[PDB]
Symmetry: C3
Subunit: 150 residues, 3 copies
């Protein structure tokens, strides 16, 4: 397979500029994906993640809900569904926003694996998303290969 | 509010050069703070943290007790009181001591949030404290804004 | 003491080029060590770690089993035996493979302490091992000193 799901975590948007950016990048990179699910912060992120993992896809990309603001629980919902975490990839994604956006260091976004599915939390701004996608460009294919055992 | 508490973790000092550095920086940065609490390693750090969180302040800065030496439990006491952690900020603080102090990578200091209070573990040397405070200079105001929901 | 144990995690090798590299480096650095234990991924890594910790040595270096491939459980076995972790040293080791090996960010290797024993997960390729050993060259002696209380 070479499939992907996109989840946009935003209570504000759910009643979005990042979804089309991610969908285009996935298209550009050769992935098939469904229309992004735009969901409210918190439990709806978890439900969306569960739905996507049950679709049996290769990669799930989330955007939004990763800072320290009251409603930012994307990383916590992501921790609850993964088998394990990839802390170096989450750090690379943070560092991709530096030095130009100092607040990049506040992002709590994680990366991990749920079975055979790689999950990556991106920032909730278009710039951050593009920064994070540049990092994934350099590793994603190798990551999916490694995940599948070559 | 724009309030702060300082905790110096040192059994040696508790029976300190970092406290006045931090108090000055907080003054310089516009925060009101109380005289730093100088406490012994371990449980007294936890108690100090609890006291400060119960004071309802915006930021708690600790210094000391973050290495790998037997009595270094500041990070462990900090993990036990926070609701969540901000691993990118703790990494930024480490990296602020590099390349000049290679042992900066051994620091276990964490950053996190307890309710509406941001907590940041700094190193126990004046140089490390200054290095860490330079990092906070670039983000602290934005972090507190994000924490409060703008 | 100035003692070390080496564990090579590889099901493929266990029925190895990294072991002799590590043994030479330890010799070069003044450590006494035993012949590296080459073990299969998973539970045998845990057993090897337990055996080494029970030998009462100053440092344990592992190689292999740190990526995201199905059988890569070296970090998980290492987490289960340590008293605490040193996340900055594990990050330094990752960053030592960048920018030349972008996939360095996928390594889940950890560093930690079990009692008085420092444990460091290195990558499973000779290049990565050499990259990680360069990092340890700059800090290991100070780390062991700090661990012992000067």
């Amino acid at each position: 397979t070479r499939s992907a799901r996109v989840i946009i975590a935003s209570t504000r948007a759910s009643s979005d500029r990042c979804g089309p950016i991610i969908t285009e990048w996935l298209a550009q990179q050769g992935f098939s994906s469904a229309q992004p699910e735009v969901v409210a912060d918190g439990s709806p992120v978890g439900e969306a993640l569960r739905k996507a993992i049950d679709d049996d896809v290769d990669v799930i990309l989330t955007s939004g809900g990763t800072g320290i603001a009251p409603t930012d629980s994307t990383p916590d919902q992501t921790v609850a569904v993964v088998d394990y975490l990839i802390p170096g990839l989450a750090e690379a994604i943070r560092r991709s926003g530096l030095p130009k956006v100092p607040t990049s260091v506040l992002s709590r976004g994680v990366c991990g694996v749920a079975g055979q599915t790689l999950i990556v939390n991106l920032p909730g701004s278009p710039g951050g998303v593009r920064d994070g996608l540049g990092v994934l460009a350099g590793v994603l294919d190798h990551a999916l290969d490694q995940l599948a055992g070559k």
